[PDB]
Amino acid sequence: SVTALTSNVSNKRSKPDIKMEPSAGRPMDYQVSITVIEARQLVGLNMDPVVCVEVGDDKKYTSMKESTNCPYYNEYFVFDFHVSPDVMFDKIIKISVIHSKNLLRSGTLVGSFKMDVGTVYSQPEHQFHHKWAILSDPDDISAGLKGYVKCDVAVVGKGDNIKTPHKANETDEDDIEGNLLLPEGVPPERQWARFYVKIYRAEGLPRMNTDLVDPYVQVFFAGQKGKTSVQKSSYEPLWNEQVVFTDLFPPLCKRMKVQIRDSDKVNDVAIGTHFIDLRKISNDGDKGFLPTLGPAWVNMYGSTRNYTLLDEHQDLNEGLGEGVSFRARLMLGLAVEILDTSNPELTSSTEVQVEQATPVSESCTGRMEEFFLFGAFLEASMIDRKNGDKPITFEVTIGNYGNEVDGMDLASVSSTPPMRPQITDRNYFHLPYLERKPCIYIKSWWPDQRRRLYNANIMDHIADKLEEGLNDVQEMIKTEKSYPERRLRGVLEELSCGCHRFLSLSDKDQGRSSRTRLDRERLKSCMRELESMGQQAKSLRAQVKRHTVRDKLRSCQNFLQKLRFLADEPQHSIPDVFIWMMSNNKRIAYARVPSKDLLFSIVEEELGKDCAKVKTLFLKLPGKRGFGSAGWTVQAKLELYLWLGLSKQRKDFLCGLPCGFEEVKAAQGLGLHSFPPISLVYTKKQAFQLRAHMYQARSLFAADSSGLSDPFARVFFINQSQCTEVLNETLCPTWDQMLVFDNLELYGEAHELRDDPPIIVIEIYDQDSMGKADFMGRTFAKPLVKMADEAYCPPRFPPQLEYYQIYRGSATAGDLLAAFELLQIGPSGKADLPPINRGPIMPVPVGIRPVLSKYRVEVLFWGLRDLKRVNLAQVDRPRVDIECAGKGVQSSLIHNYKKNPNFNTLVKWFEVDLPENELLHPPLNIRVVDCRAFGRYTLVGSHAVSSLRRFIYRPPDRSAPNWNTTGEVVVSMDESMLDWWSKYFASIDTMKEQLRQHETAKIDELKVYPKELESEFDSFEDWLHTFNLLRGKTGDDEDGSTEEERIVGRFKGSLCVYKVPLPEDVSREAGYDPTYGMFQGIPSNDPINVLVRIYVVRATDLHPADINGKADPYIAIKLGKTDIRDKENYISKQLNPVFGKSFDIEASFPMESMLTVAVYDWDLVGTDDLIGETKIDLENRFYSKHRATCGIAQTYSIHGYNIWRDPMKPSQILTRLCKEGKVDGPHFGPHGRVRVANRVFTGPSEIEDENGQRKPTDEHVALSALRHWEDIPRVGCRLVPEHVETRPLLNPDKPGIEQGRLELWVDMFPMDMPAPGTPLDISPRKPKKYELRVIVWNTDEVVLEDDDFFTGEKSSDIFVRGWLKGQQEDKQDTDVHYHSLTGEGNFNWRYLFPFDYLAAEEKIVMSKKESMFSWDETEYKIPARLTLQIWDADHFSADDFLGAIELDLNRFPRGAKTAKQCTMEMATGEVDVPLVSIFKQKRVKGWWPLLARNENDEFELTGKVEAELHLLTAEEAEKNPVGLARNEPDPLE
Template sequence: MFGLKLKKKKKDKAEKGLVLTNKGAQDGNESEIPQKGPSHQEGPEDLTKDDAFLAPGPSAPSKRRAKLLTKIHDGEIKSQNYQITVTITEARQLVGENIDPVVTIEIGDDKKQSTVKEGTNSPFYNEYFVFDFIGPQVHLFDKIIKISVLHHKLIGSILIGSFRVDVGTVYNQPGHQFCDKWALLTDPGDIRTGTKGYLKCDISVTGKGDILKTNPKTSDAEEQIEKNLLIPQGFPSERPWARFYVRLYRAEGLPKMNSSIMANVTKAFVGDSKDLVDPFVEVSFAGQTGRTSVQKNCADPVWHEQVVFKEMFPPLCRRVKIQVWDEGSMNDVALATHFIDLKKISNEQDGDKGFLPTFGPAWINLYGSPRNHSLMDDYQELNEGFGEGVSFRGRILVEIAVEILSGGAQESKFSKALKELKLSSKDKDSKSSKGSSKDKADKADDSKAQQTTDKTNSTEVEVESFAVPPEIIPEKYEDFLLFGAFFEATMIDRKIGDKPISFEVSVGNFGNLIDGGSHHGSKKKSTELTEEDVLPLLHEGEKDVAQDSAISMASTTHPEKPLVTDGNRNYNYLPFGAKKPCVSFISSWGDQTFRLHWSNMLEKMADLLEEGIEEVRELVKVSQEAPEEKMKTALRDFITQSRVFISEAEKKPKTLNQTALDKKRLTLCWQELKAMADEAEGVIRQQKKKLSLDEMIREAQNFVEKIHFLVDEPQHTIPDVFIWMLSNNKRVAYARIAAKDLLYSPIEEQMGKHCGKIKTHFLKLPGKRPPGWTVQAKVDIYLWLGSTRYSNTILDNLPVGYEAEMPPKSSGTHHPPSALLYQAQHVFQLRAHMYQARGLIAADSNGLSDPFAKVTFLSQCQTTKIISQTLSPTWNQMLLFNELVLHGEEKELLESPPHVVVELYDSDAVGKPEYLGATVAAPVVTLADQDYEPPKLSYHPIFCGNLSGGDLLAVFELLQVPPSGLQGLPPTGPPDITQIYPVPSNIRPVLSKYRVEVLFWGVREMKKVQLLSVDRPQVLIECGGGGVKSCVIQSYKNNPNFSVQAEAFEVELPENELLHPPLSICVVDWRAFGRSTLVGTYTINCLKQFLCKPRETFALTSQTDGDGARPAISDSLAATESSNLLSSSQDLPADHVYVDVEPPPTMLPDSAQAQTATLVDIPDSSPMLETEHKPVAQGPPKDGHGKDPRKPSRRSTKRRRRTIADESAENVIDWWSKYYASVKRAQKEKENNHKEKRATEAKPDEVVLDMEDGPKRKKDKMLKKKLKDDGNDAIPNLAALKIYDGDLESEFNNFEDWVKTFELFRGKSTEEDHGLDGDRVIGKFKGSFCIYKSPEDSTSEDSGQLRIQQGIPPNHPVQVLIRVYIVAAFNLSPADPDGKSDPYIVLRLGKTEIKDRDKYIPKQLNPVFGRSFEIQATFPKESLLSVLIYDHDMIGSDDLIGETKIDLENRFYSKHRAICGLQSQYEIEGYNAWRDTSKPTEILTKLCKDNKLDGPYFRPGKIQIGKKVFSGKTVFNEEDSEEMVESYEHLALKVLHSWEDIPEAGWRLVPEHIETRPLYHKDKPGMEQGRLQMWVDMFPKDTPQLGPPVDISPRKPKGYELRVTIWNTEDVILEDENIFTGQKSSDIYVKGWIKGLEDDRQETDVHYNSLTGEGNFNWRFLFPFQYLPAEKQMVISKRENIFSLEKMECKTPAVLVLQVWDFERLSSDDFLGSLEMNLNSFPRAAKSAKACDLSKFENAVQENKISIFQQKRVRGWWPFAKSKELTGKVEAEFHLVTAEEAEKNPVGKARKEPEPLAKPNRPDTSFSWFVSPFKCLYHLIWKNYKKYIIIAFILIILIVFLVLFIYTLPGAISRRIVVGGS
């Protein structure tokens, strides 16, 4: 049955059982021996490239070994620092009346709150909050950011609305942030109510080294909120509510052990054998959690409960967390955790392609800590989702479905996709399905289930039971056989090697003999399974086999005592020898292997494409031809494979147990592949767009990432396979392998990549591992996992030449073998050619290491010599491993030899060697009958955990020892004196003589070493055995530069550039008595950047152009730049520059020359400068050289400046005008770039060439017009400066065009990412290198200056005047407990320190400093400028917020001319006066002279440099007369701005700019603490005519007074009702205030008893306020609370609030309506009350809006609104006057003097009941009811008369009788 033939053995071997021999090798059966890989002759060529070629990939399926991985294992999940920053800008459209909104932000347990804004539905905050977190990325990303807006009350604030997003969603955004987005607020208590308002905010998540972009916050009334919502790109703006159902059916195979100690103790005493676990499931999503009922004492619980979440769809939270818990008497303990990413179970695409999140019903496999029965779990964090699970902990059957709610949350029918999921009816009693166990949780759950109707509309989690739909049929189980053969077990840690060792292989609980527990379901079910287990392996294939008794299945190997490794006592190994132990067992799982098959197909495609990309990269490295063709071939292969997959998938194979997600995912996969294949076609053909190789690689890499996303199958099937190493039956170390990688399929593409392959596994410790070498054993194991139907193929891919030994008890032929016996054995010799390493990790305190390497192969280990004090050791050592016995066929060993492991250590005099990293390599095999070819050295990457630990240059060859013995092997060469064999010369790289020139400039920022300052440093350069020393600096404090600038040395380097050794820079300090101390080191691993091309020809051409040798900046660079510029010059759009592409044969006159020249653009740095674009008016010809061009230009520019000023009589134009114009322009550019980017993203194949110039001009004019309309502060023709988002260094390559700065390291390299390790930097070395092949003719060299010195300035001390301008800071980290800071500036340069403490800005995180400082300094002694921002504290020392450092020296000497930025326009006076000490013509002349260029020649309207002619305006009108004046400064400045277009000598010059520098704090390395806008000007001290510094002091806000006269109101709603008459009326009064100045709230008197809603007031409000017209912001200074010592200044838009109220005597007044108007942009008033309409007011377009700052006086009618309904109209007049005018012409408040207002003529009904009661009776009762009152009065008199008559009549009669009777 196995394809094996039975062979009789001798009787003495009969006890061992039957032995099967593999005859495949002799039979030549093609089906059993797959195709061989390439022959040995092809091998060595492949090996010269990187390790990607060393191991066979999926393209060679016949290989016996899996692909070689150089990385031993991934490192630990590290805790990282993260900063979450939230800026709350403003809120709009908040629901509620007269609310006082406050914003709270909650992230985890942290909560922060904004200030309270009073009486507004659109508050402006502009507040910044910072949250710091430390932890693993995975767990931080699940945290929810919850932002809520509440109506503030003294007791219990009321929630208006809230918004949730998880941190991971924010981090996945471009730039890790949402910027200026509107968060939609909803009420979690009632989802029917819809939107509760919008909150504009920025949310960013930054880790170490992440860079953020900051934008100043502004409020734009015109903003379209719906188009700018806070949602990821691609999400719809309208998100409906949805129900997320997570259904929990049942769980299987949970650990039986109860986690609580008491329960275990009870079990120990009572001896109870039942399950002690009480499981329940907790499901968390979007910050909410629901839990099921508890199933008592059950390891296989059945719940049938669903947890229902309500969230908007698509949700902004990505993961559902499913956690199984064990209920304990004291506390609950997590058993296992699993996360489901919604992105993987849904598809966001539109149309029929997309689908809602759907999952299962499918099993989820749970992993966590080992299932041991110890009282305390050492690895509990693994069960909570921290780290990789090391053991199977059961599985849970889950289903997820989503139902979109169309209306509110009423019960709606399921959508089409969810028809099969039927909800249980609500009236069903949930108690019946919950079993008999009734604890408190159950009762609580029951009561919840009863009240579901109350919860329907809230987002509260519901937990309810459900009936299993009849469509869900019990799944069909299938038997899977796992077979494993152990080929090697070496490198076993010595600590565990003293006891017998065995290996256990398990799948789920199968094979887990120590603590496995139940396999599936209840006990009854497991007995059924055991009966099935005894059946033969083949159900269909082998009908003739007799039914056996149970098959003996072994999942563990026989325990064996390990032996000590030869050459390394720390390692042991198991002596398997010729007998390889095997394991095999059957497990039973649901048959959904099709999922794994699809995954495997996709993964193989991704791997193959990745290999292709890697090969292309290698070809590029080696600079070989045709990498593009190779790339296209790889893409063609990918297209072919995609089509195979698509054709398979389109067949829609019908398989049982398919879920809805299975079908959808398959469709998604083939659709994605189809799209990718089409894109790949486009890339190959390159029809629409010519792609460079880099772009092709990027596209291909993109495909790989997309496929990898599809590979991950969220619905689990077979659990992962675990290999455990057991020492004395105790678990020690493990390896975990995904089941899909081992799964067999008869179709090659669907087979797992490691199925039937020998794979090297490095076993690791469970849980948190100690640093260093944590590998416990290296195991080579052959694994095969598949259905028992295919068990006849389990041995197919084993190396041939074995005999299979059967287990002793078996009697049939259908058993997997218990061991493999390899008869053939061969003797080999391994030669490890250890040449050198580079870039190793520093392990000693001085920043170096003493590295040596341990090479382990099979049971032998050898060590190289130790090279002291280096990070790039050259061992040049060959290690010989003799008498290596390898078992198996020669051919097999040739194809798949065992791997070599190389570990690197740092030798310490005391203590154990320190681990530096390791790599794995495959040896090159040469058999005895093959011709010997020397292998080629290649670099092998070294990894220390996850960190890159450098590269090892080595090669390993495995030579078969011929019968003649070792003499028959290739010669090794003689050993040296120490008996060390060097690497043979035919393997060592071919060397050539190179000359290395070194420029020594100086050392900087040297810290103390061994408590002493560095005073006499010297630099040592070493490369490839050669080196050179600098001279010693005599006094570092006085002059840190070297007196001798350049040195050179010759060295032999490999001809192959890839094999070049590293170059090391060492700095030593010479101390007393001739002692020297190592200060620090730096290693340059790649010399390619310093290789210079031979420049003889280049030098000749440049000398013919000028008067001698041209200064070489970087010859190759200049050459490439010039060629690029020349080639690209034709593509530029046209402007006013003439360039002769070819020199004309004869010299033409100017006009003719102009006609024949080519038009080329000068990029104009000021596109708004209109005067420059007018055609040149030819004035009278003047001699440009004879006249001083500077003289008349003053007048011409003065005239221009005045016209600019005339455009606004209101605003004085100053530097800030220029700043705000530049900010506006920068924002506009960003928007345009963003639009262009989106356009290109939408159509990646199209190329947009921006050739036209005309439309652009038109656009600029339109922009100007808009700016003009925006207000008088935006003046069009303002000069602008460049605002950089980052620092200037990143724009200009660190100004390293003349010298490079190398950081010197000292101290141990930490486990963290050492790229950001600032603590190890001990100083800096400034210098440069030039490496080139030594010329044959040595006499031509050394004929004067070294090549590297040309163009380098002298390095003697220079005195400089430095001006530092600090403009503003953004998003500073809060330093005070109240979440604010009091920042001030400190400058440090050398010993100079300027503290600006007195000018601190209280309570501000976005301060505007506007400060300038002057410092005198001497370079190089004082060249590092530190700008620090401190927080001012009243008590205690001030805290540092952050600092930034600037190397001024690099800027000073740079060719980019960073000393003073070139302004965009040339002017002599005013806000844009020329700052530089040299005029543009002088700068131009100097540049031409320095670069040996011919020119400049000034001619009317032209400037000529060499053969390039620039044309522009040089004639201007004189200010006072009509005389024309000539000035070349403007044109010269334009030439300077386009200096990079000059051939050969051109480069970018620094424009006038503001740089935005990040601030850092040493306690939080790599984390930005804010940003600083600033710039620096530098002038040599000997410069004449230095102008005054630019005045950038902040603008003082302008005082204004707003006079608001409330005349009348109309149609105000009537709130009161007369209890007698039912008549409606209102007692109207109007309140008013300016937002932010609520203390100055004013109100009118009351218009009583308005019956029609009319009110007459004639009442004046006076609101004085401070305003900045340029920023359109009002400045408010006030104390935050009564305890605040200082006033806090904040800027908000000027918004006037008017409210209409109904006066109440006994209760609080009733709010009737409000009106909010941004004084800068509010709708025009209606002329009459009738024309006043709310819709017109709310929907007013920008054209119909006015600004009070322009109009000054406005009168008319405006509407009051409440809850978006019209509640009244007000006639008001606004009059804005400046503070000075208000003082000159004061007016009275209310109706007071001066200029009192007349009392209103109110109707007679307008009065108060209390003040005029008689008036009230007359008007309200007598007037209306006079008739009735008179009638009533007469009736009353009559009634009184009658009553009195009847009352007195009896008395009168009786008296009469008595009296009369007497």
């Protein structure tokens, strides 16, 4: 349907999202993982390439590969940072290839690739996978392609989740050009370009020497830097100097750091920093434009302008946080000229050149116009009392105008008169303005670029209305209001109407000649993009329905962020307005309002959102002091009227104020109606009464060491504060308290007071012993205003309770269920008000408090697991008190916790009045206490079940088609070296195909899960749930504890909440018994020994834990008392180990059920480092209805690779599942069929054993029934298949970032049942031994290297060098064919290359020490590549390299029949020669071209080699032996 709602349905407008901690400059743990896989087509002669990987300033190196232009590394690097996102995304990832690097000489560079971290982070999975970095010479614009480096680059923040692909076998002919390391839309060939950063002049610089300043401008771009000259002793410097960078276009480093700095001999320091975003000043595609900026001003912000010997906020001058003061304004320019690299006229140097720019006038930035800024401080409350009782001023400044202390007709009044604060409460002051509101007015002069601010105002007006609508949709989804899809269609209609309005509005004032090129280009880009946004919104409106509303709501966030991106004007016009609180002339706290928000326009859409309005500001501490413990308290709270505009437009600059004031003006302004006042004296005043219905809170912050709090809420309104009562030892208080703010005085008749009420600040505190209180959080509210003429009638009144999101810093700290109403005391006094019905404490009145219905809460008490020590004492007699809304039940005593942590009474219950609205249900508190002697109960831990919606019983859907249970439905269905790795790799390929299908048979398979097994079976919580007990104070979001180390135990059990008068037929269909209640089918609680068999397959992408960038992983398993540490079987120097292990641990379930599988880096000296660990919780797996004990294989077999692991046969599993589910069956008739309930399965009736005779069996059709157990009518359930799950490895020391992926699975077998056999042989495949024999027969047309000293005869002493594993382990040389005059050599020399080989990986396996000083042997896997080189032997100098070919033993070209048919096209990029594998044909003889790169970096034919490659196995080589060189057996001529 197309009908829609165009108005706000919910009350999200009354729940503001004010946060005192911004996201600007907040550091966060980041990790860049770069896997250098290989390189190809590297440009060099006999090069030993080393790939250097730099991220930021840290650089790491691969190992050196000898004499190859296509090296293979497969090396993993991890770079760790703790920086803000803007600093992080500006870091340069530089993947270089160098050679000849050693201990005192830096390497010669071959080629480099650059990008920044933000380009990788803007990818769909924050990563590139298997992409080729285009290397280029960074010092030569005329040089060509220097090679490619295949690599993975991934960026993760703390808490990000990446769908990382599994590393399968890489046996493919990979296309380099279709898989380049470039973002989408960047062309594969990138030109060179010059980035002219023209630096004209600066104004308004602060004091830096002690007292002049000597500024220069340093520009950073893509890792390069260049600076202008120093303009000594000038606050208005004039450079007219351009800094020219030579870099590739389009650049993958998309930000430029322009920074004015002061020149000192000792203390060269930053003044201000601006970042030019190249995304905002350019566009790609056909209708795009080159990056252009200016000539236009740019505003720089940073620390306070007063000079100190050391600066606390010097990081603000470097641009690392939000600037708290105006530093300077820099007149700026940017142009990009694409260089013609084929021209030999211009120089090919890439060095940063600082040249003289062409000077342009000041009138090019717009004519200077007079601007008038007016402020009216209506209210100044909530002032931090730690600043003292000294008098308080508020200084407003804009640029340097109004800065009478630090900055450098009408006289501007920039500060309020000083006024002593009065006490609101123990934490807060307020300034007693009352009727006398102090005012400020500032004259300033800025260039007239109001059109930029107007267009930004229209775009941000559309974005503001869009975000308000999407917040309305999200909130009314959360509160379950009817028809959320109708509101979203109205939001999209309103968005498309705003986008159409922008096109009609933004094309005014194009006749100004002061438009820059960027103004015209970004105007065209904004019109095009908002027209496409309007059409896309009209298209997305028709697709919004009931079931699709959440994903379309997600898709509208793209429109929102694109509007926020386009609304940011990169050419600054008017600097932001700063409001500073002062006492003893000390700058205490600041707010910063953008000047486009205050700008005045005739057009409503061009008008700023805060212009001519009373703006609620919250001042905050500058710099890092505004975060953490210091930034918790509200520094000040202002109701500041603000107006900015032209001085010609100030006729109506008082129109937004509340009416009923007299203007008191300065002495020079007497008798002038246009003169602004220095104060307003209000004569009208309206009496009001605020009712704070503080009913409840939930999920609050824990500010005591017991894990609880003593919360009371302090409600702030205007200058008054009132407290609720303190409720002890709870994180979900039911205060149930009405706070009445009597006879409030609202000065003046505020315009639209119903639609914009004054804000209410609610602060939660934990009461402590000595009168002090811990801050717990802060929410904001807006009251529902009743005017005097309004009736207190539905649907508006009485107000309903709603959840207000409490924030403690940036972290969420619970919800406050409250309602607020602001009732006007009318002409008839307080008799017009509604009546008011524990001492003087008033309850929340009827009609606002929730209507209560009776519920029964039944608790299953299953057990208590891993109860940690309290006060250094072991928990011995635990008891689980459960309390919900005052009522509750207590569990039976566990008389001895160690021998039996079971409850004697399984199911208890209690009755409690809960709200009829299930969204208003209070949380249920699980509390575990230890019963010491003499009634001394100490708290062990507590868990808060925040939502009971999961545990609410409703009668099940028996109208479902599965329940019908009647009518028959029929469901129908070399080799010897296959092992478990065959089915594993087949399942990996199948999982890859299913991941490709979700994005858009010879070998039996298992189910590889990309995540945990818990993620596919809702954590196995079908009947049994986990409730983590918590103790201790909740940690802060920076330098604090996470929730996991507050866990002091687990409570096992379930809940079942239902309304007390059940229907009798509903109760009987649920099978209600008096002993177990609603919990039917509960398994036995008795202890049972379980054999836990943990198969550890492999680990991928382990975090390095040694100084060499690798680790030595082994598996350490904890389960109960068993602590296996397999440090004898560590895999040395490997970050992607293949363990292939199994571990048998007998554990006493359900007590010893927390399984910890960890990976530890073995260290020779010192303790072994933890890499990561995972927790599996096998109890939920063991007792699940999903049968997560042993995985169910796809097919049944009794031999081979697909052998059935389970000691229970499929017929036994089917019989047990039918017996426990009370299903008739399994009825085996003939061996091919079985009937289970109404459903009939058919399949094969016979099974083959190891020797292949046939035997009739029921197991195939029983397994067919088990595979379709989900389709069973009564108790049908999806059984857990045979699987390999991928579990992330987590380190508590580096939280939030997954730093390994351990592929494993766990099989559990009860030991009262028959035991399983031996564990599966999942040990890694042994490499098949081979021997490659390479008979170098002859060489022809080898180039002549030597020149004779006497006659000048050209000759070569040709010998052939060959290896297969490497130069240092496998190299063999022929004897030298001395003095070849025509390039002909005769060798007949046989190489022998014995090697171990894995056929699936196509890798040669060898074991050798990494260095001569290394402790152990490391397993290496290289590609099978035979390298043949020709060399010239010299007696008195080094031998000279002549040419080489690298034959991949699976994909090398067929050798030519003669030497004349051998051409360069066999080895180069031509495809005309078919490829041949030596593992398939075993004998390839022919001629191959040997190539070398000349000084022009092109391949040339430097020789040909006749060779015979003969691949045999080792067993064939022993029975038919030959000798090395020409020796016996089988001698050569």
